[PDB]
Structure formats: C-alpha cells, structure tokens
Design a protein around this ligand. Structure first.
Ligand code: CDL
Ligand code: PLX
Lengths: 175, 122
C-alpha cells in the first residue's frame, strides 16, 4: 500500500495467470477460499473499519526531525573541543544513516531472491550488483575502525587510502 | 620544597590577609560547610555512643555545640583555602604574562592538514 515509497522498495508489475479449468470436478481450493473469505475476511474487515472510524475522529501528527549540517572534523582545530564534539555527533548520525542504507539494499536483495523462485540466479543480478557496490563503499568507509571508533580514525583511514592511491597513480604514470 | 613561604609581602602568622577580602565569601549553604556540619553531628553521635548514652536523644545542647563549632571552623578554613587557590592562579597568570618567550602560542592546524597514522583493528 501507500505506507512505503515504491521507488525505494520496488516490485515487478505482478503478472498472474487466469484460471483455466480442464476438469469437470470442482476445485476444493476455491470452495475453501470462499468459506475463508465469508467466515474470516469479513469480520476482520468490519473490525478494522470500526477501528479506523474511531481513529479518524482523533487525527494528530508527528514530524520527522531535521538536522542542519555543521562543520566536519576536517575543519576543526586540533584541540577545539566544541567543534570536535559537533563534528563527532554529525559523523555518528551519518554512520547510522549509512547502516540503514545498507539495510535497505539487503532487504531488496532478499526480497528479489524469494520472489524470483527457481530463476533467482539470473533474475537478481541487478540487486546483487547494487549490494556489491554499496558493501564495497561501506567497507571502505567504516571497516576496521574497531571499538572506540571516531571521526578522527575514519579521517586517518581515508588519508592513508588516499596516499596509497596517489602513490599508485603516480607510479603507473611513470610506466 | 616550599612554594609560598617566601612569597613577598606575606605576614608570618596572619591566616587571612587583607587582600583576601576582595574575594567572594563562601555561601552559608556551601556543600563543604554542610559536610563539616555533618562531621560535627557524627562527632556528637559518637560522643553519645562512647559515653553509653542514648545515641540520638541524649544531649541536644552538646550536639548543637558540636555542629556549630564544626561549621564555624569550616567557614574560615574554606575562606583561607579559596584565598590560597586565588593566589596560585594570580601568580601563574602574572608569570605567564611576564615571560612570553617561554609560553608561545603556535600556529593552529586543522585536522584536514594533520597526518595521523591509522591502526586497523583486526
Ligand atoms: C557515603 C555517604 C554518607 C555516609 C556517611 C558515613 C556513614 C554514616 C556516618 C557514620 C557516623 C554516624 C553514626 C556514629 C555513631 C554510631 C555509633 C553507634 O554505636 O550506633 C549505635 C546507635 C544505636 O544505639 P541506641 O539507639 O542508643 O540503642 C542500641 C544500643 O546502643 C545497642 O548498642 P551496642 O553497643 O550494645 O551494640 C554493639 C554494636 C555497636 O557497634 C556499632 O554500633 C558500630 C558503630 C560504629 C560507628 C562507625 C565508626 C566511625 C564512622 C566511620 C564510618 C566509615 C564509613 C566509610 C565506609 C567504610 C565502612 C567502615 O557492636 C556490634 O554489634 C559489633 C558488630 C560488628 C560489625 C563491625 C562493623 C562496624 C563498622 C561499620 C561502620 C559503618 C558506618 C556506620 C553504620 C551505622 C552505625 C549506627 O545507632 C543509631 O541509632 C545512630 C544512627 C542513626 C542516627 C542518624 C539519624 C539522623 C536523624 C534521622 C532523620 C535523617 C535526616 C535527613 C534529612 C531529611 C529530613 C527528613
Ligand atoms: C585528619 C584531619 C586533620 C585536622 C588537623 C587539626 C584540625 C583542627 C586544628 C585547628 C587549627 C587552628 C589554627 C587557626 C588559628 C590561626 C593560626 C594561623 O595564624 O596560622 C597560619 C597557618 O595556617 C594553618 O596552617 C592552617 C591550619 C588548617 C589545617 C587544615 C588542613 C588539613 C588538610 C585537609 C583535610 C580536611 C580538614 C578538615 C577540618 C575539620 C599562619 O601561617 P604560617 O605561619 O605562614 O605557616 C607556618 C608554616 N609554614 C610557613 C612553613 C607553612
């Protein structure tokens, strides 16, 4: 339904075939599902309708909290405690958001694997590629920081990787 | 070593120089004063216990005198301690001001220009 964004959690157009009876015998599944409908789905629907009627008479709202951007750890002086504190809080929030991004991608992958059935090895290639890219980026950002991680250690890791990449590029240039 | 014995202008046995009158006195609800009164009350209770008297009820005048004496001494003790710490800060700041060569303020560097080694945890 409309509870979630359908672009963040996409699904295929859901093609399902029409019944094609070939036997004169009746279908026990159809009879049982008609009984289930009439005996289960209607009272539950009525209870939900009553509950939603009660809810509509009391409509109140909650809001998503907004955070502005503060200077990063790169723009902080060495011993400036306040700027470091704000930058560290911002970095921790970004870390949580990145974890949730990875979680969304993994949810997509799992759903595709279940959905595609016997053809999952070929029909889930795109989700697997997206997970591979996101996992590589996340591993580059946050892996091996250890317990007691911080923004400063992440910055040191990025600087080390940048130095290695610059050296490799200059050595390949001399080839 | 003695830091403050030979500090110029120090009166030998004063316990409270006139300069200390320029500092804010401790409040009468200072938690340190409350703890000193608590020490006096404990002294009164122990006095009752040692003398084989009912600990909480035996002498109310004696307990009151205990608490009052402890608070009275603690007030002046706190005043002198605050004065000594103020003197230490004053001398430290004056010395830093009079010897700028020994206390330079070097140029500030941001963390985007400081190379820190990264030690992976694995
Ligand atoms: C950290 C946070 C703050 C904590 C502060 C520090 C701890 C508390 C303060 C310490 C000093 C306070 C008490 C000193 C005098 C006590 C001496 C004593 O004998 O007590 C008996 C006495 C009872 O005697 P009694 O009523 O006359 O009749 C019974 C007979 O006397 C029967 O007596 P008896 O002689 O025949 O019985 C024999 C008994 C008699 O032996 C004793 O009673 C032992 C007492 C030794 C006193 C403590 C030593 C000096 C203080 C140092 C404490 C160090 C603390 C740091 C941690 C390390 C722990 C050691 O000996 C034994 O049975 C042998 C037992 C072996 C065990 C050994 C362990 C002893 C050391 C443990 C000390 C723990 C702290 C104090 C515990 C409470 C004691 C009452 O106890 C009391 O009733 C007095 C205590 C309560 C009064 C205070 C209440 C205030 C008013 C109420 C309202 C509150 C106002 C709040 C404001 C808000 C408004 C609503
Ligand atoms: C285990 C608890 C320790 C308690 C010790 C006994 C406490 C009760 C004794 C009360 C002291 C009476 C003194 C008040 C009368 C005025 C005297 C005054 O003129 O003396 C001054 C001196 O002031 C005293 O020294 C201050 C006494 C206060 C001591 C308390 C400090 C204890 C350490 C913290 C523990 C908590 C204590 C709790 C109190 C109940 C002069 O200074 P000065 O002549 O130039 O010093 C000579 C020595 N020098 C130069 C080498 C330094």
């Amino acid at each position: 339904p409309d509870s979630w964004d359908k672009d963040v959690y996409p699904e295929p157009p859901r093609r399902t075939p029409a019944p094609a009876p070939q036997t004169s015998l009746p279908n026990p599944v159809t009879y049982l599902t008609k009984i289930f409908d009439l005996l289960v789905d209607r009272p539950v629907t009525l209870a939900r309708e009553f509950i939603e009627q009660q809810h509509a008479k009391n409509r109140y709202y909650y809001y998503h909290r907004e955070f502005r951007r503060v200077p990063d750890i790169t723009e902080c002086e060495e011993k400036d405690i306040l700027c470091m504190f704000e930058a560290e809080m911002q970095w921790r929030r970004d870390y949580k958001v990145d974890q949730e991004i990875v979680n969304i991608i993994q949810e997509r992958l799992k759903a595709c694997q279940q959905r595609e059935g016997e053809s999952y090895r070929q029909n889930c290639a795109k989700e697997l590629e997206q997970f591979t890219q996101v996992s590589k980026a996340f591993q580059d950002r946050y892996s091996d920081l250890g317990a007691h991680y911080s923004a400063r250690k992440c910055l040191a890791k990025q600087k080390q990787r940048m130095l290695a990449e610059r050296k490799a590029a200059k050595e390949a240039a001399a080839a | 070593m003695t830091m403050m014995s030979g500090r110029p202008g120090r009166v030998p046995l004063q316990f409270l120089p006139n300069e200390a009158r320029s500092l804010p006195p401790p409040k009468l609800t200072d938690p340190r004063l409350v703890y000193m009164g608590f020490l006096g009350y404990c002294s009164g209770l122990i006095d009752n216990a040692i003398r084989r008297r009912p600990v909480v009820s035996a002498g109310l005048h004696r307990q009151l005198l205990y608490v009052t004496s402890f608070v009275f001494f603690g007030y002046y003790l706190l005043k002198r301690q605050d004065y000594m710490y103020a003197l230490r800060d004053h001398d430290m700041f004056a010395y830093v001001k009079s010897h700028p060569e020994d206390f330079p303020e070097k140029d500030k560097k941001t963390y985007g220009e400081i190379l820190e080694e990264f030690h992976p945890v694995r």
